[PDB]
C-alpha cells in the first residue's frame, strides 16, 4: 500500500457532499456554529438541507439565497408553512418548527414531536 496524511480546513466539497473542517483539520458533526452562522452536519459529516432538531428547537437549514441572502445550508429565519416535498412543517414567530397539537388560522393540526412533520389524513 501507499498512504499520506493530509489536512483539510474550512468549508470543503467532495463531489456533491459539503463538509466543514475546523482549524485542527477535524471534521464536524451535528449542529455547528461556523463564525456565527449555524449549520447541520449528518453523522457522516455531510451537510444537510431540511428541518433538523437542535438545542434551539427544530430549524430549517436551507439552500443559498432562500431568505435574507443566507449561505448554503445555514439556518434561516423562516416563518409560515413550509413544504419540502411530501413533508410539511409550520414555523413559529420564534423561527422554530411547531410541534404537537396547534391551532393555526382556526384549524387544528398535529406535528410529530420527533420530526416536526405534519401528521396528515
Amino acid at each position, epitope marked *: 500500500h501507499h498512504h499520506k496524511g493530509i489536512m483539510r*480546513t*474550512g*468549508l*470543503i*466539497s467532495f463531489e456533491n457532499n*459539503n463538509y466543514y473542517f475546523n482549524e485542527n483539520g477535524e471534521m464536524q458533526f451535528g449542529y455547528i456554529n*461556523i*463564525e*456565527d*452562522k449555524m449549520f447541520y452536519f449528518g453523522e457522516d459529516g455531510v*451537510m444537510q438541507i431540511g428541518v433538523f432538531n437542535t438545542p434551539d428547537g427544530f430549524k430549517y437549514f436551507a439552500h*443559498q*439565497n432562500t431568505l*435574507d*441572502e*443566507n*449561505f*448554503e*445550508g445555514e439556518s434561516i429565519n423562516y416563518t409560515g408553512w413550509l413544504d419540502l416535498d411530501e413533508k410539511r412543517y409550520y414555523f413559529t414567530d420564534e423561527y422554530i418548527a411547531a410541534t404537537g397539537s396547534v391551532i393555526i388560522d382556526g384549524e387544528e393540526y398535529y406535528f410529530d414531536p420527533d420530526t416536526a412533520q405534519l401528521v396528515i389524513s
Partner: nanobody
Amino acid sequence: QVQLVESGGGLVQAGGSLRLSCAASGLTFSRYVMGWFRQAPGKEREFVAAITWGGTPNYADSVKGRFTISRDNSKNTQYLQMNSLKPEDTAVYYCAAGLGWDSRYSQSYNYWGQGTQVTVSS
C-alpha cells in the same frame, strides 16, 4: 443593481507589490464569501484567494504566503495584498461574491467583477 468594482490594478516590477481593491454595492456585503480569481491569456481562470464572512482567509497553493486577503465589512470592500510578485502572477484579476459552499470554485460565486489587469515584468 449588483456591482463589484475592481481597482488598484496595473503595471508593476517583479518582487514589487500591489494592493487590489474590490468595492461592493447592491448586496448585504457581510453575508457573502468574497473571492479573487485570475485568468491569464493562454490559461484557464483559477482560484486565487477567498475570505469568509467572519474573516477567515484561504489561498491557492501558488500565492500562499505571498498574498493576503482581507475585508472591511463597514466599507463593503475587500482587499488583496499582493507581495513578492512574479511574472507568473500576470493575469486579469476578478473579484467575486458568493454564497456557495467551497470557496475554491467558480460556481460557488454568484456575483462577478469586470476584472482588472495586473502586469508584472521581469
